[PDB]
Design a protein around this ligand. Sequence first.
Ligand SMILES: CCCCCCCC/C=C\CCCCCCCC(=O)OC[C@H](O)CO
Ligand SMILES: CCCCCCCC/C=C\CCCCCCCC(=O)OC[C@H](O)CO
Ligand SMILES: CCCCCCCC/C=C\CCCCCCCC(=O)OC[C@H](O)CO
Ligand SMILES: CCCCCCCC/C=C\CCCCCCCC(=O)OC[C@H](O)CO
Ligand SMILES: CCCCCCCC/C=C\CCCCCCCC(=O)OC[C@H](O)CO
Ligand SMILES: CCCCCCCC/C=C\CCCCCCCC(=O)OC[C@H](O)CO
Lengths: 4, 157
Amino acid sequence: LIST
Amino acid sequence: PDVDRFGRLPWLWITVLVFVLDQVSKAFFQAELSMYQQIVVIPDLFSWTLAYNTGAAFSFLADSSGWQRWLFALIAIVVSASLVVWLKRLKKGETWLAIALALVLGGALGNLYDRMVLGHVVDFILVHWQNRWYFPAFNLADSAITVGAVMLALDMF
Ligand SMILES: CCCCCCCC/C=C\CCCCCCCC(=O)OC[C@H](O)CO
Ligand SMILES: CCCCCCCC/C=C\CCCCCCCC(=O)OC[C@H](O)CO
Ligand SMILES: CCCCCCCC/C=C\CCCCCCCC(=O)OC[C@H](O)CO
Ligand SMILES: CCCCCCCC/C=C\CCCCCCCC(=O)OC[C@H](O)CO
Ligand SMILES: CCCCCCCC/C=C\CCCCCCCC(=O)OC[C@H](O)CO
Ligand SMILES: CCCCCCCC/C=C\CCCCCCCC(=O)OC[C@H](O)CO
């Protein structure tokens, strides 16, 4: 889910 | 009233609100900045920036690059679905969980849209301490996810  | 016919579904307006603010945010800094350019807000501590996250943090898992776009999109899609049903199964007066779920969903869809439409996720928030250490650039979607995730984590008391 997050950017990274 | 109408509040009773749609159940817990109208909490998704928080998800939409998160998604939109996330996309307006990114659009702005895509327009105002070039890659890795940074607008200083607090010289030692905080700056705006522009970075494209193709996910190099998980590059150690493969001799190929470019798969994060699809694998992470896939995970977003899967997690989003399960998150929606679990929002639906909630009761009124479980307001903490509804918000936390909606926040994570908004962030999930925000970055999902990026990985699908763009080849990457747009990052503009650069927090740091001088030149000693730099925190990985993030966005509002991440913030919604993180705040949402923490709200869930503090639910187990
Ligand atoms: C009722 C709903 C209320 C809405 C409440 C909104 C919460 C916003 C308040 C503080 C934001 C703090 C955000 C913390 C930022 C975390 C940084 C992060 O998650 O980084 C992601 C990752 O490292 C990058 O790839
Ligand atoms: C460029 C960004 C585009 C983002 C714009 C997306 C707009 C989608 C609006 C409606 C479709 C699905 C709505 C999903 C949430 C509906 C919540 C619900 O079911 O509530 C019904 C009732 O109105 C409760 O008051
Ligand atoms: C990226 C920053 C985004 C953070 C911005 C703040 C996020 C939401 C804050 C207030 C919610 C606004 C009200 C939205 C409607 C929720 C109430 C609702 O519809 O729930 C009733 C439901 O029928 C159950 O019984
Ligand atoms: C969390 C919900 C809060 C609201 C969600 C949307 C806000 C997004 C955050 C920052 C974008 C707008 C902040 C404006 C700061 C950038 C403007 C700027 O400094 O650029 C000027 C120009 O580049 C000359 O240098
Ligand atoms: C807790 C939830 C937070 C919600 C998030 C919304 C608040 C907006 C964030 C910072 C506002 C400060 C604005 C500073 C940005 C303008 C940069 C500036 O100072 O001007 C740039 C100039 O061109 C060269 O210095
Ligand atoms: C709150 C509003 C809800 C937000 C909903 C989340 C956004 C939906 C995710 C993708 C939509 C676009 C579908 C893209 C179809 C996949 C094929 C593709 O992207 O291919 C592009 C190109 O051909 C390869 O370089």
